[PDB]
Amino acid sequence: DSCIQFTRHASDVLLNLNRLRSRDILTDVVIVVSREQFRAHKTVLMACSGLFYSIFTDQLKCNLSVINLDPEINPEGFCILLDFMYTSRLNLREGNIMAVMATAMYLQMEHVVDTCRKFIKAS
Amino acid sequence: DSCIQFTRHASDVLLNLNRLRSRDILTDVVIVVSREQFRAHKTVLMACSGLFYSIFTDQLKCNLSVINLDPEINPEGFCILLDFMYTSRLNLREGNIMAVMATAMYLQMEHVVDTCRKFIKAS
Amino acid sequence: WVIP
Amino acid sequence: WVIP
Ligand SMILES: CN(C)c1ncc(Cl)c(Nc2ccc3c(c2)CC(=O)N3)n1
Numbered sequence: 176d177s178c179i180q181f182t183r184h185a186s187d188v189l190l191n192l193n194r195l196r197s198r199d200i201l202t203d204v205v206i207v208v209s210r211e212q213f214r215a216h217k218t219v220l221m222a223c224s225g226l227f228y229s230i231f232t233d234q235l236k237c238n239l240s241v242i243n244l245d246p247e248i249n250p251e252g253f254c255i256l257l258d259f260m261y262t263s264r265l266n267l268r269e270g271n272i273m274a275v276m277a278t279a280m281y282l283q284m285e286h287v288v289d290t291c292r293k294f295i296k297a298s
Numbered sequence: 299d300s301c302i303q304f305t306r307h308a309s310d311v312l313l314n315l316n317r318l319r320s321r322d323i324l325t326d327v328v329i330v331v332s333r334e335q336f337r338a339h340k341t342v343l344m345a346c347s348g349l350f351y352s353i354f355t356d357q358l359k360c361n362l363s364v365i366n367l368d369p370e371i372n373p374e375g376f377c378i379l380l381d382f383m384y385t386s387r388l389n390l391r392e393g394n395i396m397a398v399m400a401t402a403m404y405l406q407m408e409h410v411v412d413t414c415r416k417f418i419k420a421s
Numbered sequence: 422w423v424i425p
Numbered sequence: 426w427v428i429p
Pocket residue numbers: 221222223224225226228283284285286314315317318
């Protein structure tokens with residue numbers, strides 16, 4: 176086509192979606208990870224994760240307001256990944272990299288799994 | 299912080315949100331523009347437009363599944379702007395620039411209004 | 422704004 | 426991935 180493009184548009188959209196999350200505006204699901212609860216937007220979860228994409232395209236699960244993750248999933252690993260989904264920023268540290276990689280493999284977040292594998296290979 | 303960043307993350311998120319829109323997945327509102335109807339995600343509309351942000355943060359309007367725009371709004375201008383919201387791409391043409399600018403001013407999409415003003419000033 |  |  177003959178379209179023009181606004182370079183910062185996608186980043187600005189994601190920044191506003193994170194502002195809505197921080198104010199709990201139009202969040203439509205709670206993700207339960209052990210004792211911890213995380214509110215989010217189903218569309219953002221689907222856009223970032225192969226697991227949530229499969230869950231919320233399911234004709235029955237698409238209507239659930241509560242999703243319980245596998246008890247092996249670490250709440251801190253999930254929190255770091257949820258922050259990444261809404262910001263593009265990953266808080267990857269020596270003390271959390273194993274839990275982050277395991278959570279990203281479960282959530283099917285291919286690019287995160289790739290950087291964790293590379294950071295582990297280096298050490 | 300000591301975060302790493304995935305450059306293409308925001309663009310990939312927006313691409314997936316547009317894929318959900320094209321398949322009518324988790325759309326939660328219909329925007330009525332004269333005789334024309336446009337399905338969308340309230341969160342994406344809020345993230346892109348000062349008008350939708352104000353509408354869906356309203357304690358009563360946040361629950362509406364149908365929003366009717368001012369009858370002066372042109373459906374083609376709205377369609378071009380809705381496509382921009384989900385892609386960062388604006389189909390700005392000599393034949394649509396006046397309707398696009400008027401719709402962007404109504405929707406409170408500051409960056410679109412700015413490029414329309416610049417393109418009009420050049421001609 | 423750019424030409425994509 | 427980059428250092429932002
Ligand atoms: C694959 N597909 C057509 C599609 N459409 C819409 C959405 Cl929201 C979506 N999201 C999704 C699926 C798989 C994966 C991701 C997002 C991230 C990932 O690593 N794998 N994937």
